[PDB]
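Appendix B. Extra example for self-study. Work through it before the problem class; the solution is given directly after the inputs so you can check yourself.
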Amino acid sequence: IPTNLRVLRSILENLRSKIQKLESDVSAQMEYCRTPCTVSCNIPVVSGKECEEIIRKGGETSEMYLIQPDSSVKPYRVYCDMNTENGGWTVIQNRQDGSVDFGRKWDPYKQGFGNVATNTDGKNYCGLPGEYWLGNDKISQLTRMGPTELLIEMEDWKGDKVKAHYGGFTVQNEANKYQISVNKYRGTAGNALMDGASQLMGENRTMTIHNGMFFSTYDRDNDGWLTSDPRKQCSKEDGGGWWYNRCHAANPNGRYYWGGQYTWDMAKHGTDDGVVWMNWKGSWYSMRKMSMKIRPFF
Amino acid sequence: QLLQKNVRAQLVDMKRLEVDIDIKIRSCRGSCSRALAREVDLKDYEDQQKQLEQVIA
Amino acid sequence: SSIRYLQEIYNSNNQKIVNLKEKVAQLEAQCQEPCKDTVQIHDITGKDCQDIANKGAKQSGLYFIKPLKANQQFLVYCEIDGSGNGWTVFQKRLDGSVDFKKNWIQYKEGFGHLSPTGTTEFWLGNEKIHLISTQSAIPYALRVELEDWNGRTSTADYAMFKVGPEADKYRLTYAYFAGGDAGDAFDGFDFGDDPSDKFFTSHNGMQFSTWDNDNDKFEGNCAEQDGSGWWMNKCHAGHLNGVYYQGGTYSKASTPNGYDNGIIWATWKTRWYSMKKTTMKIIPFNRL
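Solution. Structure tokens for the complete assembly:
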């Protein structure tokens, strides 16, 4: 009681200097944002419907390409991974450094956002992927062209890695709330999408299965929770768009926590809102790398 | 007298905010000319968070 | 025992937080857009770059075109001059950044990169060259432009230029040489004593060859030997898809097979001199 005005005076004086530092940090970054970052992604001559056709046409290096899935569709940029497994992979989602905000609304997730690709060293082409989400209209159109497979890969902060391969993958259109279906699992990451979280059992595990779910963003609730209160939402402000149930065993589009480990008291709404794959690392580990890649199934 | 020891409540708000700001500044690296090189000292926050609960026992 | 609360430090911090959160929200709205890409594609489209120029496009750069018989549109670099001529560029060499030792499919479909600035190396693809140059009843012309290592440029023009279909191995054809100070390397070159060297180094009517699809007039494999795809005879006098040599000068000792495999045009420079830059581009003949 007598020794109480000592540390309690220094704790508040610590916090006020922390607010001054944050105040300065945010302000400095704001000046940097007076002008944008730039790229010069000169376009490969070789094009096709997607990245599989492109590799069949001799496009054998991983980089940005222009694809035109349909003559009715405007040609658009994508990162093609030509090296993983048999190549021909169209990247639809990528995380690697937290350089892009994935806490976005319905329209951004609909249209696509982030950086497809960036220039490497002093090259006149963009051979490195950026962080991005291709866009739900585009993802739906690609998966519905024919049987499509899905490769999800992730890496922790120690350099270990696992994968989740889904031989079958489909995304319905906006009218159908971009409903997801996955099957034919194999891999090392654990079947989070079909089986739910491996640490949960019964009802509680079942309510984490993503297969069959609709897409929701924090301004568009299509999750598993049917209760009429704003407090019960899987996607809250600055939360990722994902195929939420009640709520998730996995969220590739979660918030990028540095170093991997995070806790409830670091999270904006006290939830496990990170780049998560519970079946590998649990709810409170945020991946260092996470990506999603599709390809026509053969 | 004034037993307003709710500085443990402001300490919690600062921890969230530090992390939230760290994430938000980082998300500017893909938008803006320059990205501010910075860190978060969760160790400093928890060392003095270990206190307060210590001096109030 | 002392009695001082102060505590304005606490309330002033809460207010400093609420105002900081406002600043943080404002920074968030400034970090939503992606990096700005300097590379943009123009909106005007047409059958070729001349059609695009005719529709009022004034800027050289990247455009989609769709020849009538093409199943899909494809991207090209268009060169548009101050006189409304729209050249479709199908080959560019500039700095040796792109490997031209490519297979049949790669030469069929195209490789390298397209830039608004025309500063990148590429091969547009034989299928596309065929589609552009065989549009119904539209005579085409080819211009070859060359640059040496001392900044001098030269050209060679070929009238009624056509590239045939894959079924005829993308055969190169033209009616006649239409002039230019680079000379007519497509007519072959009288290199030495052999009375048949000029005949065997001409390029008119030659089918296209790559290492994995040999359609030349040689017992061996010209394209495999010289590391390229080209309309090989036995073997060549103009060879623009050859190996890029810095400084121009190279020799037999430079090469694995002992042959001249550089970027050559025998009527302008010795076959042991390799061009700094080349451009192969096509336009409707009536524009000339």
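Self-check: The domain at 190-288 of chain A is CATH 4.10.530.10 (Gamma-fibrinogen Carboxyl Terminal Fragment; domain 2). If your reasoning did not lead you there, revisit section 3.
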